[PDB]
Amino acid sequence: TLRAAVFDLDGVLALPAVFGVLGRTEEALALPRGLLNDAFQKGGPEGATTRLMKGEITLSQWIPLMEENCRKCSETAKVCLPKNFSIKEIFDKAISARKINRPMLQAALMLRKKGFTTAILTNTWLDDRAERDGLAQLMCELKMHFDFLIESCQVGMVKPEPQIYKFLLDTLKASPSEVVFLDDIGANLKPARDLGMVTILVQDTDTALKELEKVTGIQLLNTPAPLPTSCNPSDMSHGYVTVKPRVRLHFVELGSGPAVCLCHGFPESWYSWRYQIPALAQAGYRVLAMDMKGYGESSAPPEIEEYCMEVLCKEMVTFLDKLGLSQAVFIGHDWGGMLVWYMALFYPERVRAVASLNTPFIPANPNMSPLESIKANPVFDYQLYFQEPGVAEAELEQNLSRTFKSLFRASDESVLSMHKVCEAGGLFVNSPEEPSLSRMVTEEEIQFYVQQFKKSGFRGPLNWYRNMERNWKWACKSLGRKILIPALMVTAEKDFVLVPQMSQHMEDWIPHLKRGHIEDCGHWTQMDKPTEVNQILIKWLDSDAR
């Protein structure tokens, strides 16, 4: 009975195989067949390549020894290599061309999701080339998805020597019978097979995957589109910045490149961006996913005035000051989307670009109180219910698992009837005590929100709604301005609070505004449609945010 899958890197998890370029170069340069592949394997277990693969020498030290072997091979074949032939040039191009074999990774991911232990076992080198980062990035992306990565140059052993296989089994803590081994080189397959392991010879991916699903009994081929990679909270880098004596802001940080500051809504967390964090970092950005003031590990002072937009925005500027960031791209959802439009209006020098999910940019009406304005739209009735301090806190804090299970649901799962909220008494008055689990979330993900909200509750979050008058007066100071920095507005078809039509007049204040639209998407945009949010944001980031 299988419980472990082992994959090679070259020709298995990554394609085209780096080995296959020696023959490609022979064909392209009309050189004698197997001339370059011979120079590569020259000396066998005593040769330069074995020393490279065992880690005795680096790739830059091996390049000249390979060049010498190419010369000795041509002496016997009675031929001559071209004028400006470069081994470095051949391997630089081959390594760059080698990309992840996405369906093979999906299979490894699915096997791991079903309880399998996974490992990458590879014959590799210590890369000190000036262009080594490309390979480093590839290894980083691949390795995170596996329980183990066994590199020949690190363990000083190599395939097909039988010691690396007993090493593999020892790291796996499993008998050969429980292990599937996939490899493109038959010689490297042999020792795993003659030990009792199930083996697959990888030529084309599809057949290899047909063989893999037959032996495991798990569907891996033609399977549905998987969700983007998520975040395990304990595996993240957690950051803490004191913005003022009583206020500390917490954030999760992943990646390198331009800073992208993610701002959640009500009643959320940095974790609401769980599907965007690995994706945006992988796309070449430095992600800073906030716990907004009043949430999670960030400070939650009790004062209402602490949550007005002016102070929230000033504190986000201090956050940038203290981290040494002259700018960041600001991406917000819901109440975070509103903060993000104000960051752009009041601090354009600190905002590289601005994006909002669901939240439109609507200027303040100087001829109407925000209380009158909110009473004009019956969908915003619950906001009046959120005004009185202690009232909504009591209902929202009564049963946390019920609060999030009732709130976080797709457009076709609506359990909340948000009309006549104050008249009916509360938010969950006609709601079940034990709500069903939404298709958008696991019980584990609900319990993370539950655990986060156990620290400060709903006072701080609800205070974001309690500065309507302060925010209105502040917003009025920006009525003569326009948003002229790069901006993105993303609408969600089935958000019944933040309807797409509420964003229709935005190009009057943001003429260069770019847009995105998500069909069959409710209010909880990030977890409802993660693949498309990622697609929209990465495309806009790469085009407008450097």
Ligand X SMILES: O=C1CC2(CCN(C(=O)N[C@H]3C[C@@H]3c3ccccc3)CC2)Oc2ccccc21
Q: Which does 362 bind (CB under 5 to 8 A by kind): a copy of itself, ligand X, none?
A: ligand X
Secondary structure (3-state) at 225: coil
Number of residues that bind ligand X (CB under 6 A): 15
Pick 215 or 325: Cβ nearer a copy of itself: 325
Contacts of 24 (CB under 8 A, 6+ apart): none
Cβ closest to a copy of itself, residue 95 vs residue 182: 95
Work out which of 7, 181, 251, 266 binds ligand X, going by CB under 6 A: 266
Instruction: State the nearest-atom distance from the C-beta of 324 to a copy of itself, in Å.
Output: 4
Nearer to a copy of itself (CB atom), residue 287 or residue 410: 287
- Shortest Cβ 314–ligand X spacing (Å): 17
470-529: which residues touch ligand X (CB under 6 A)? 497-498, 502, 523
Q: What is the total count of residues that contact a copy of itself (CB under 8 A)?
A: 59
What is the closest distance, in whole angstroms, from the C-beta atom of residue 45 to a copy of itself in the complex? 15
Query: Which of 8, 291 has the CB closer to ligand X?
Result: 291
Q: Is 37 annotated as a binding residue?
A: no
Does 449 carry a binding-site annotation?
Answer: no
Taking CB under 6 A as the rule, does residue 407 contact ligand X?
yes
Distance of CA 359 to the CA centre of its chain: 23
CA dihedral over 11, 14, 16, 19, signed as positive or negative:
negative
Mention every residue, 6+ apart, whose C-beta is less than 8 A from residue 410: 438, 439, 440, 522, 524, 528
Q: Which is nearer to a copy of itself, 115 or 324 (CB)?
A: 324
Closer by beta carbon to ligand X, 320 or else 475: 475
Assess contact for 18 and 10: CB atoms under 8 A: yes
The type of residue at 384 is L
Residues listed for the chain? 546
What is the rounded distance in angstroms from the CA atom of residue 171 to the CA atom of residue 138? 23
Q: Considering the complex, what minimum distance in angstroms separates the CB of residue 448 from a copy of itself? A: 16
Query: Taking CB under 8 A as the rule, which mask of x and - marks residues 481-520 in contact with a copy of itself?
Result: xxxxx-----------------------------------
Residue 131, SS3? coil
Residue 55 CB contacts under 8 Å (≥ 6 apart), including other chains: 125, 126, 152, 153, 154, 156
382 is in an annotated binding site: yes
Is 495 annotated to bind a ligand? Reply is: no
Annotated catalytic residue 334: yes
Window of 193-201, 272-280, 334-342, 482-490 that interacts with ligand X by CB under 6 A = 334-342
Binding string, 132-171, against ligand X, x = CB under 6 A?
A: ----------------------------------------
Given 295, 465, 528, 544, which residue is catalytic? 465
Question: What backbone phi and psi angles, to 5 degrees, belong to 38?
Answer: -75, -45
d(CA 41, CA 182): 22
User: Which of ligand X, a copy of itself, none sits in contact with 127, Cβ below 5 to 8 A by type?
Assistant: a copy of itself
Active site annotation includes 523: yes
Q: Where are the beta strands (DSSP E) in 104-246?
A: 117-122, 148-151, 179-183, 198-201, 237-244
Is residue 359 a contact point for ligand X (CB under 6 A)? Answer: yes
Residues numbered 522-541 forming contacts with ligand X, rule: CB under 6 A: 523
Residue 143 interacting with a copy of itself (CB under 8 A): yes
Choose the contact partner of 540 out of ligand X, a copy of itself, none; CB within 5 to 8 A by kind: none
Number of Cβ within 10 Å of residue 63's Cβ equals 16
> Helix, strand, or coil here: 274?
coil
Q: In this structure, are strands 4-7 and 179-183 parallel, antiparallel, or unpaired?
A: parallel
Say whether 58 counts as a known binding-site residue. Answer: no
Token readout for 463 is 């205070």
Looking at 334, 495, 528, 544, which residue is catalytic? 334
Restricting to residues 50-79, name those near ligand X by CB under 6 A: none
Measured distance CA(478)–CA(343) in Å, rounded: 11
38 binds a copy of itself (CB under 8 A): no
Tracing tokens 């076992």 back to the chain, one arrives at 121
Buried b (16+ CB within 10 A) or exposed e, 376-398: eeeeebbbebbeeeeebbebbee
Q: Among ligand X, a copy of itself, none, what does residue 368 contact (CB within 5–8 Å per kind)?
A: none
238 CB-near residues (< 8 Å, 6+ apart): 250, 251, 252, 253, 297
Binding of residue 61 to a copy of itself (CB under 8 A): yes
Q: Is 250 a catalytic residue?
A: no
Q: Is 184 annotated as a binding residue?
A: yes
What are the tokens at 419? 């009309």
Pick from 56, 147, 213, 381 the residue near a copy of itself by CB under 8 A: 56
DSSP codes, 62-112: HHHHHHHHHHHHHHHTT----TT--HHHHHHHHHHH-EE-HHHHHHHHHHH
Task: Give how far the C-alpha of residue 476 lies from the chain's centroid of Cα atoms, to the nearest Å.
Answer: 38
DSSP 7-62: E-TBTTTEES-GGGHHHHHHHHTTPPTTHHHHHHSTTGGGSHHHHHHTTSS-HHHH
Residue 200 or 309 having the CB closest to ligand X: 309
> Cβ atoms within 10 A of the Cβ of 21, count?
20
Q: Which of 264, 333, 523, 528 is catalytic?
A: 523
Binder among 103, 348, 363, 457 for a copy of itself (CB under 8 A): 348
- Interacting residues with a copy of itself between 455 and 484 (CB under 8 A): 477, 480-484
Residues labelled as active-site residues = 334, 465, 523
Which residues are near ligand X by CB under 6 A? Answer: 265-266, 334-335, 338, 359-360, 362, 382, 407, 427, 497-498, 502, 523
Which residues are near a copy of itself by CB under 8 A? Answer: 51, 55-58, 60-61, 126-128, 132-133, 135-137, 139-140, 143-144, 154, 156, 234-242, 253-256, 259, 278, 281, 286-287, 321-327, 346-350, 352, 477, 480-485
